[PDB]
Enzyme design. Sequence first.
Site, PDB file in Angstrom:
ATOM      1  N   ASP A 189      15.304  -3.319  11.415  1.00 18.33           N
ATOM      2  CA  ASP A 189      15.569  -1.867  11.390  1.00 18.33           C
ATOM      3  C   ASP A 189      16.988  -1.678  11.897  1.00 18.33           C
ATOM      4  O   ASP A 189      17.245  -1.739  13.104  1.00 18.33           O
ATOM      5  CB  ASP A 189      14.577  -1.111  12.253  1.00 18.33           C
ATOM      6  CG  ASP A 189      14.745   0.408  12.174  1.00 18.33           C
ATOM      7  OD1 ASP A 189      13.723   1.114  12.283  1.00 18.33           O
ATOM      8  OD2 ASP A 189      15.876   0.861  11.968  1.00 18.33           O
ATOM      9  N   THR A 247       3.892  -6.056  23.307  1.00 22.08           N
ATOM     10  CA  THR A 247       2.881  -4.992  23.283  1.00 22.08           C
ATOM     11  C   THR A 247       1.573  -5.456  22.652  1.00 22.08           C
ATOM     12  O   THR A 247       0.987  -4.738  21.845  1.00 22.08           O
ATOM     13  CB  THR A 247       3.423  -3.736  22.572  1.00 22.08           C
ATOM     14  OG1 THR A 247       3.856  -4.067  21.249  1.00 22.08           O
ATOM     15  CG2 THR A 247       4.589  -3.160  23.355  1.00 22.08           C
ATOM     16  N   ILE A 298      -0.100   4.994  -0.036  1.00 21.80           N
ATOM     17  CA  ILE A 298      -1.190   5.928   0.035  1.00 21.80           C
ATOM     18  C   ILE A 298      -0.666   7.263   0.518  1.00 21.80           C
ATOM     19  O   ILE A 298       0.197   7.326   1.406  1.00 21.80           O
ATOM     20  CB  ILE A 298      -2.298   5.308   0.915  1.00 21.80           C
ATOM     21  CG1 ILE A 298      -2.989   4.225   0.085  1.00 21.80           C
ATOM     22  CG2 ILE A 298      -3.296   6.352   1.410  1.00 21.80           C
ATOM     23  CD1 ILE A 298      -3.729   3.187   0.884  1.00 21.80           C
ATOM     24  N   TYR A 338       3.252   8.180   0.912  1.00 23.12           N
ATOM     25  CA  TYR A 338       4.018   6.937   0.887  1.00 23.12           C
ATOM     26  C   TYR A 338       4.288   6.423  -0.525  1.00 23.12           C
ATOM     27  O   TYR A 338       5.082   5.477  -0.676  1.00 23.12           O
ATOM     28  CB  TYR A 338       3.381   5.858   1.779  1.00 23.12           C
ATOM     29  CG  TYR A 338       3.578   6.038   3.280  1.00 23.12           C
ATOM     30  CD1 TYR A 338       3.151   7.176   3.940  1.00 23.12           C
ATOM     31  CD2 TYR A 338       4.200   5.062   4.035  1.00 23.12           C
ATOM     32  CE1 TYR A 338       3.344   7.335   5.281  1.00 23.12           C
ATOM     33  CE2 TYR A 338       4.360   5.197   5.387  1.00 23.12           C
ATOM     34  CZ  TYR A 338       3.941   6.332   6.012  1.00 23.12           C
ATOM     35  OH  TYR A 338       4.141   6.484   7.361  1.00 23.12           O
ATOM     36  N   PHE A 344       0.847  -1.202   0.000  1.00 19.53           N
ATOM     37  CA  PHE A 344       0.000   0.000   0.000  1.00 19.53           C
ATOM     38  C   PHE A 344       0.878   1.246   0.000  1.00 19.53           C
ATOM     39  O   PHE A 344       1.795   1.365   0.826  1.00 19.53           O
ATOM     40  CB  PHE A 344      -0.943  -0.034   1.214  1.00 19.53           C
ATOM     41  CG  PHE A 344      -2.006  -1.081   1.108  1.00 19.53           C
ATOM     42  CD1 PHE A 344      -1.719  -2.430   1.255  1.00 19.53           C
ATOM     43  CD2 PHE A 344      -3.297  -0.723   0.780  1.00 19.53           C
ATOM     44  CE1 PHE A 344      -2.700  -3.389   1.096  1.00 19.53           C
ATOM     45  CE2 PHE A 344      -4.276  -1.676   0.622  1.00 19.53           C
ATOM     46  CZ  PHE A 344      -3.978  -3.005   0.774  1.00 19.53           C
ATOM     47  N   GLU A 369      -1.633  -4.579  13.668  1.00 15.49           N
ATOM     48  CA  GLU A 369      -0.648  -5.516  14.257  1.00 15.49           C
ATOM     49  C   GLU A 369      -1.200  -6.218  15.484  1.00 15.49           C
ATOM     50  O   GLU A 369      -0.937  -7.404  15.728  1.00 15.49           O
ATOM     51  CB  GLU A 369       0.641  -4.773  14.574  1.00 15.49           C
ATOM     52  CG  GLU A 369       1.750  -5.601  15.146  1.00 15.49           C
ATOM     53  CD  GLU A 369       3.018  -4.779  15.262  1.00 15.49           C
ATOM     54  OE1 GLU A 369       3.222  -4.136  16.318  1.00 15.49           O
ATOM     55  OE2 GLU A 369       3.769  -4.759  14.267  1.00 15.49           O
ATOM     56  N   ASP A 415       4.640  -3.867   4.452  1.00 12.95           N
ATOM     57  CA  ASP A 415       4.772  -2.401   4.480  1.00 12.95           C
ATOM     58  C   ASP A 415       5.632  -1.909   3.305  1.00 12.95           C
ATOM     59  O   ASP A 415       6.529  -2.612   2.846  1.00 12.95           O
ATOM     60  CB  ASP A 415       5.428  -1.924   5.782  1.00 12.95           C
ATOM     61  CG  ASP A 415       4.502  -1.935   7.003  1.00 12.95           C
ATOM     62  OD1 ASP A 415       3.431  -2.603   6.977  1.00 12.95           O
ATOM     63  OD2 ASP A 415       4.864  -1.256   7.991  1.00 12.95           O
ATOM     64  N   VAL A 416       5.375  -0.664   2.849  1.00  9.66           N
ATOM     65  CA  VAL A 416       6.082  -0.098   1.702  1.00  9.66           C
ATOM     66  C   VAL A 416       7.368   0.657   2.046  1.00  9.66           C
ATOM     67  O   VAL A 416       8.240   0.799   1.180  1.00  9.66           O
ATOM     68  CB  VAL A 416       5.152   0.844   0.896  1.00  9.66           C
ATOM     69  CG1 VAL A 416       4.883   2.169   1.613  1.00  9.66           C
ATOM     70  CG2 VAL A 416       5.677   1.082  -0.514  1.00  9.66           C
TER      71      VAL A 416
HETATM   72  O1  GDU Z   1      -0.142   7.680   4.981  1.00 16.48           O
HETATM   73  C1  GDU Z   1       0.066   6.432   4.967  1.00 16.48           C
HETATM   74  C2  GDU Z   1       0.183   5.668   6.128  1.00 16.48           C
HETATM   75  C3  GDU Z   1       0.425   4.296   6.037  1.00 16.48           C
HETATM   76  N1  GDU Z   1       0.553   3.688   4.817  1.00 16.48           N
HETATM   77  C4  GDU Z   1       0.778   2.239   4.607  1.00 16.48           C
HETATM   78  O2  GDU Z   1       0.604   1.573   5.855  1.00 16.48           O
HETATM   79  C5  GDU Z   1       1.845   0.977   6.246  1.00 16.48           C
HETATM   80  C6  GDU Z   1       1.960   0.983   7.766  1.00 16.48           C
HETATM   81  O3  GDU Z   1       1.981   2.324   8.276  1.00 16.48           O
HETATM   82  P1  GDU Z   1       3.333   3.032   8.760  1.00 16.48           P
HETATM   83  O4  GDU Z   1       4.514   2.488   8.002  1.00 16.48           O
HETATM   84  O5  GDU Z   1       2.973   4.481   8.680  1.00 16.48           O
HETATM   85  O6  GDU Z   1       3.465   2.697  10.342  1.00 16.48           O
HETATM   86  P2  GDU Z   1       4.485   1.721  11.166  1.00 16.48           P
HETATM   87  O7  GDU Z   1       5.788   1.535  10.437  1.00 16.48           O
HETATM   88  O8  GDU Z   1       4.544   2.058  12.621  1.00 16.48           O
HETATM   89  O9  GDU Z   1       3.754   0.330  10.938  1.00 16.48           O
HETATM   90  C7  GDU Z   1       3.763  -0.724  11.896  1.00 16.48           C
HETATM   91  O10 GDU Z   1       2.634  -0.576  12.759  1.00 16.48           O
HETATM   92  C8  GDU Z   1       1.377  -0.553  12.060  1.00 16.48           C
HETATM   93  C9  GDU Z   1       0.277  -0.515  13.108  1.00 16.48           C
HETATM   94  O11 GDU Z   1       0.377   0.671  13.898  1.00 16.48           O
HETATM   95  C10 GDU Z   1       1.194  -1.734  11.096  1.00 16.48           C
HETATM   96  O12 GDU Z   1       0.931  -2.985  11.739  1.00 16.48           O
HETATM   97  C11 GDU Z   1       2.436  -1.941  10.230  1.00 16.48           C
HETATM   98  O13 GDU Z   1       2.311  -3.110   9.434  1.00 16.48           O
HETATM   99  C12 GDU Z   1       3.656  -2.022  11.128  1.00 16.48           C
HETATM  100  O14 GDU Z   1       4.860  -2.197  10.407  1.00 16.48           O
HETATM  101  C13 GDU Z   1       2.887   1.755   5.458  1.00 16.48           C
HETATM  102  O15 GDU Z   1       4.141   1.093   5.359  1.00 16.48           O
HETATM  103  C14 GDU Z   1       2.202   1.954   4.129  1.00 16.48           C
HETATM  104  O16 GDU Z   1       2.248   0.738   3.366  1.00 16.48           O
HETATM  105  C15 GDU Z   1       0.435   4.476   3.673  1.00 16.48           C
HETATM  106  O17 GDU Z   1       0.554   3.951   2.546  1.00 16.48           O
HETATM  107  N2  GDU Z   1       0.207   5.799   3.783  1.00 16.48           N
HETATM  108 MN    MN Z   2       6.430   2.517   8.846  1.00 17.25          MN
END
Ligand code: GDU
Ligand code: MN
Lengths: 288, 288
Positions: free
Chosen positions: B269, B188, B66, B69, B64, B246, B154-155
């Site tokens: 990471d 968590t 969006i 991103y 994704f 998650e 995740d992207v």
């Molecule tokens: O504006 C945005 C926000 C999120 N994303 C998508 O959603 C994913 C997850 O969101 P973030 O990367 O913003 O957040 P985190 O890295 O903290 O994500 C972690 O915590 C999340 C829950 O809070 C999810 O479980 C996710 O898979 C986990 O890696 C992104 O990689 C992206 O693929 C978008 O495309 N656009």
């Molecule tokens: Mn992220």
Amino acid sequence: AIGEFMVSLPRMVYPQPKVLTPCRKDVLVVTPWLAPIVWEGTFNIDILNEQFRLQNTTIGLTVFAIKKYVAFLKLFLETAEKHFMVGHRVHYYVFTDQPAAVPRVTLGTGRQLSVLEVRAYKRWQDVSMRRMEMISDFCERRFLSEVDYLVCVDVDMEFRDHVGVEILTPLFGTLHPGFYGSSREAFTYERRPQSQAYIPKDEGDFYYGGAFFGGSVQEVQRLTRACHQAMMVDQANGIEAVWHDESHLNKYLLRHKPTKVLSPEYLWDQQLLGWPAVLRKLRFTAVP
Amino acid sequence: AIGEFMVSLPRMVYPQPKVLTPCRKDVLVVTPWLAPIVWEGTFNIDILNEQFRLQNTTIGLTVFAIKKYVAFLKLFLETAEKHFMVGHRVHYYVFTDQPAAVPRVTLGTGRQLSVLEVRAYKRWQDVSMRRMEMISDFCERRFLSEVDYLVCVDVDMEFRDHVGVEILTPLFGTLHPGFYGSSREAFTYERRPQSQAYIPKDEGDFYYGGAFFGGSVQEVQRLTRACHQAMMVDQANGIEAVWHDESHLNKYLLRHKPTKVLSPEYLWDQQLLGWPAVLRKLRFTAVP
Ligand SMILES: O=c1ccn([C@@H]2O[C@H](COP(=O)(O)OP(=O)(O)O[C@H]3O[C@H](CO)[C@H](O)[C@H](O)[C@H]3O)[C@@H](O)[C@H]2O)c(=O)[nH]1
Ligand SMILES: [Mn+2]
Ligand SMILES: O=c1ccn([C@@H]2O[C@H](COP(=O)(O)OP(=O)(O)O[C@H]3O[C@H](CO)[C@H](O)[C@H](O)[C@H]3O)[C@@H](O)[C@H]2O)c(=O)[nH]1
Ligand SMILES: [Mn+2]
């Protein structure tokens, strides 16, 4: 059932797996094709029992007692009642030439026994080999409709400890107790290229024992059909593999890798091999 | 294909597995429910590649991108081309609100990309959470007919080393890099009983990361549908789980145990955690 919708496990309190602690430090617990190698310490039987009971799993156990080998049935079946798949549905299939001579062994609830009459071959080698054909003749007659998994064993054996749902998987073989520490060149595979069972000196994962294999009904049908058809080609060519059905089993499992491998806990001979430190449990053993 | 007739592997020369030598002495390589935990040293990729190529396996990869991103896509896709399922059929599914803004990344043979337009939610938490609904809406639209397995990531990440068919199985999760050495009380998980994602302090196997899960199309549909429906119950009750999708993923995988678990090699990471000796490979990593 296999492959059906799986309901959620209930809450369970058990020890947390620790990612930075190996479960065994003395043995290989996973093959290079990511099949578990089943040893004590690798599994929490409470979790596995839940998973398999929630699927209403039925296990069939095939055993051949032909000619004088009917004498082995009483101990085989009594000890299976104590140790084999207790708590699960079990269907024993006793193949014999003496269908009135099967001992009357008392079975636990959810467990049943069928006697299947078959011919006796003269040579022990043929009796042993022809189990593959007979097991494959019975997949369509009974097993597809009656059980989820088949376990196929020698009769001149006894259960001494737990043999349960940890073994169940689409296709399994068992490490032969005489070769688990040997290099592949020492494995007694068929080495004549003229046989369908031929395995070159530079090939082989393990030496699997003929006395204990199994899997889903579909996978056991495939294995047993393949081994029988290979045997028939050899017969037409005037060759009999060195270790008979075990040689063909080994060729099959080289080319069609099992999805679990059982450690020699599941196939042992204490008379010949003692009780090494590496065997925490002696589960299924030769009658001396 | 999955579950179809499997032809025989060709002859292969490779090192013999040694039964009395553990493949890792520093880590757990199999769960207590006999699921492999995938680390470097546990698998021979040549055997696995053969097995999966002989099934004509197609892998779908969902991502994704969006709002802002979309900036992550170029590196994500370029590095996937270098490291993800090379040699196998791959179908990328890029879900975005800006379908004309996907970079033109050159793909290898047998690899294709589809752009799927979706709405953007305002809160990042909703964007993240709603992936479960969106993935489940697309199982029927495309995935059942186009791929054998789905991998959902995740992207904001890059591939740095091999990610291949060793991960494929009916259902997998990945150990979150922040918790692989932690005791379960420190995980968590959602701890409020009012949420569908609630896990008590005395339960839990692992803390799985939201950023990397997958499995067969059927199992991914089940997981994603279940997590979405749980989210909707929470929404109706005025509660949002602490770690969003998650948290629900963790509840699902507690109750429906995965058939493989990926080590943190597959979700890392380096900025936050460095390069510990226990990571022989850093495969799929956060963009700092
Ligand atoms: O504006 C945005 C926000 C999120 N994303 C998508 O959603 C994913 C997850 O969101 P973030 O990367 O913003 O957040 P985190 O890295 O903290 O994500 C972690 O915590 C999340 C829950 O809070 C999810 O479980 C996710 O898979 C986990 O890696 C992104 O990689 C992206 O693929 C978008 O495309 N656009
Ligand atoms: Mn992220
Ligand atoms: O007169 C006989 C001979 C054999 N069998 C059946 O065939 C099995 C195998 O034969 P044996 O036990 O006589 O021979 P081994 O113990 O040497 O068997 C080993 O070698 C065989 C091949 O030579 C098979 O692979 C077998 O599974 C393996 O354990 C027996 O357990 C029994 O179930 C009979 O019922 N009656
Ligand atoms: Mn014998």
